[PDB]
Amino acid sequence: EEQKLNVGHGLAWSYYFGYLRLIIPGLQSRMDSWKKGIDTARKSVVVPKLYLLIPKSCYCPPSITAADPQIKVAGVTPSFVANRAGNQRREYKNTVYCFEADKTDFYCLVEYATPILSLYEMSNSEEAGLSSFDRLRQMRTFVATLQEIINSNPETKDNCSLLVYDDKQSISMLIKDRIEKDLSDKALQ
Amino acid sequence: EEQKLNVGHGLAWSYYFGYLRLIIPGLQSRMDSWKKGIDTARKSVVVPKLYLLIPKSCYCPPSITAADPQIKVAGVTPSFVANRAGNQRREYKNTVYCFEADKTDFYCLVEYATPILSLYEMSNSEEAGLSSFDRLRQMRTFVATLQEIINSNPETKDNCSLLVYDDKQSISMLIKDRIEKDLSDKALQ
């Protein structure tokens, strides 16, 4: 049936509790400590936000740097600890990316929304129950639900942005345009 | 709404394409090579199946051995490679467990169904959209969908068994009873 192919709401709740709720809270404070390590002649903007890439094809390439060689790994925050299910502790580190634009170095966190890779696989699969699968519809439920979850948590609301785009430009260019849009409003506030 | 809390079908499709489709196919052949390493006086049964623990609470403890100290790590298959999304290769290894019962050593693969940990978190969370969340209903959609996916792939159908149980006995005892049930029928066939 089509109902077993209602998958997007699940992918969102899983991505949040299994990952985003763990790696995002605290991010501003971590970037404040990390930012103090930049000491250069170069103008640099450090944005304490994770930019989540949601390509329309749902194809998540395995390396950011390989998809856009303008986005280069700048380093990594110090490790921190986060808890699932009350008491299940794991160590994490945020990976900082850097791209140059308009003679200024921009630093942020960037990742693909890896759960949508299953949307890609379900749409190209051969498996049996998949005839009435609608990739864009599930990608929309994912985005919509995930956006609502992220907004409902003040530890994630302002430190996370979902970037939906047609991957058929470049991702660094997309991120630069979003950073400009976001930074204007944070100054307005 | 309740519809954004229809999550079980998603957790199942994600667990399959993001994990089970990758670590299960080939398992019989891997256990055949691994089995040849057992050389002892002890009677031993090597079952080439992954037994997936689905506790009713949806609490997945972080160690099999810590939940049941009768299930001990016996070793690991040689590494193999599996592909997501056509071309995204990662290395994997199957972890073999051993428990003793009735004076015979039983060897198999055992894992908790980790996606259900998000069902646990959604039911104890405080987050906003979660008022009409029904943990058992979502755990049933998960099991039902996952069972259908696993059966539709001949590379997984016979090398995977879902063990649903009330975690309020022991898991090794549960697995032993399922192995007896399964081994009878494989002989009938």
For the purposes of burial, counting CB atoms within 10 Å of the CB of B145, is it exposed (0-12), middle (13-18) or buried (19 or more)?
buried
Pick the closest to residue B109 from B20, B14, B18 (CA basis).
B20
User: d(Cα B68, Cα B72) in Å, to the nearest integer?
Assistant: 8
Superfamily of domain B3-184, CATH level 4 = Stimulator of interferon genes protein (3.40.50.12100)
What is the CATH topology of the domain spanning A3-183? Rossmann fold (3.40.50)
Q: How many CB pairs under 8 A join A and B?
A: 95
CA angle centred on A65, ends B15 and A119, rounded to 5°: 25
Task: Please give the Cα distance from B110 to B107 (Å, whole number).
Answer: 10
> Is A50 within 8 Å of A111 (Cβ atoms)?
yes
Euclidean distance between CA atoms A120 and A55, whole angstroms: 10
CB B165 within 8 A of CB B32: no
Beta strands in chain B (DSSP E): 43-55, 72-76, 80-84, 88-92, 95-101, 104-112, 160-165
Q: N- to C-terminal Cα distance for chain A? A: 48
A86: closest chain B residue by CA: B121
Spatial distance between the Cα atoms of B183 and B109, rounded to a whole number of angstroms: 15
DSSP strand pairing (B104-112 vs B43-55): parallel
Domain locations in chain A as residue ranges: 3-183
- Residue A172's nearest CA partner among A163, A160, A159 is A163
* Cβ count within 10 A of residue A102: 8
Residue of A nearest to B114 (CA): A18
Token pair in block for residue B145: 């969908």
**Do strands B95-101 and B72-76 pair parallel, antiparallel, or not at all (unpaired)?**
antiparallel
Asked if B18's CB is within 8 angstroms of A118's CB, the reply is: yes
Nearest to B14 among A3, A11, A152 (CB): A11
For B11, name the nearest residue in chain A, comparing CA atoms only.
A10
Residue B119 φ then ψ, to 5°: -60, -45
Nearest CA to A135 out of A124, A146, A151, A149 is that of A124
CA distances from B4 to A16, A140, A149, A176, B20 (A): 14, 12, 10, 32, 25
Strands A95-101 and A72-76 come out as: antiparallel
How far apart CA A76 and CA A91 sit, in angstroms, is 13
Each residue of B122-139: b (16+ CB within 10 Å) or e? bbeeebebbeebbbeebb
Q: How far apart are CA A41 and CA A124, in angstroms?
A: 49
Residue B54: φ, ψ to 5°: -120, 80
Answer for the pair A77, A34: CB distance below 8 angstroms, yes or no. yes
Give the number of other CB atoms < 10 A from CB of residue B38.
15
A150: helix, strand or coil: helix
Question: Exposed, middle or buried, A114 (CB in 10 Å: 0-12/13-18/19+)?
Answer: middle
Token pair belonging to B91: 């290395």
The arrangement of strands across the sheet holding A95-101 comes to A72-76, A95-101, A104-112, A43-55, A160-165
Percentages helix, strand, coil for chain B, rounded to the nearest 5? 40, 25, 30
**What are the distances in angstroms from CA B36 to CA B24, B29, B40, B77, B88?**
20, 11, 11, 11, 31
* 3-class DSSP state of A49: strand
User: After which residues, if any, is chain A broken (C to N > 2.5 Å)?
Assistant: 168
In this structure, what token pair is assigned to residue B65?
Answer: 């051995």
Distance of alpha carbon A57 from alpha carbon B97, whole angstroms: 40
Task: Please list the residues that pair with A100 across neighbouring strands.
Answer: A105
Q: How far apart are CA B52 and CA B143, in angstroms?
A: 10
Distance CA(B104)–CA(A4), nearest Å, equals 41
Q: How far is CA B129 from the centre of its chain?
A: 30
List the structure tokens of B159.
């090398």
> Two tokens at A72?
């280069």
Q: How far apart are CA A183 and CA A46, in angstroms?
A: 11
CB contact under 8 A, A152 and B88: no
Q: What are phi and psi of B127, to 5 degrees?
A: -55, 165
> Shortest CB distance from A6 goes to which of B9, B60, B88?
B9
d(CA A16, CA A18) in angstroms, rounded, equals 6
**B167: which 2 tokens?**
């975690």
Cα Rg of chain B, angstroms: 18
Question: Residues A143, A16: contact at Cβ < 8 Å?
Answer: no
Task: At A86, list the tokens.
Answer: 């009350």
